[PDB]
Structures are given as structure tokens and as C-alpha cells.
Amino acid sequence: GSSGSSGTGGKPYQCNECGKAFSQTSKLARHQRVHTGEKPSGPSSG
Numbered sequence: 001g002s003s004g005s006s007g008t009g010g011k012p013y014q015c016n017e018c019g020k021a022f023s024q025t026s027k028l029a030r031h032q033r034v035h036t037g038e039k040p041s042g043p044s045s046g
């Protein structure tokens with residue numbers, strides 16, 4: 001059992017692609033545009 005932090009809080013909305021944060025999610029939503037692209041994927045649980 002290792003005690004580390006990978007995805008237990010930090011950058012929930014903050015852009016991870018480039019690593020840019022914004023005061024409000026509003027402006028952030030538009031920022032995602034720069035990272036425009038396709039990503040097909042069906043429903044999968046498990």
C-alpha cells in the first residue's frame with residue numbers, strides 16, 4: 001500500500017492538455033477550443 005496522490009484533487013477543471021488555469025470556468029470552456037479534436041468512444045462500465 002503506497003501513500004501518494006495522482007487524481008485525488010488538484011486540477012478538476014484546470015486545463016491539463018497544456019496546463020493553463022482560469023479565474024472562471026466560463027473563459028476556460030472557450031480555452032478548450034485550442035484543443036479541438038475528435039474522440040469517438042462507446043459506453044463502457046467496469
Ligand SMILES: [Zn+2]
Nearest residue numbers: 015017018020
Ligand atoms: Zn489548454
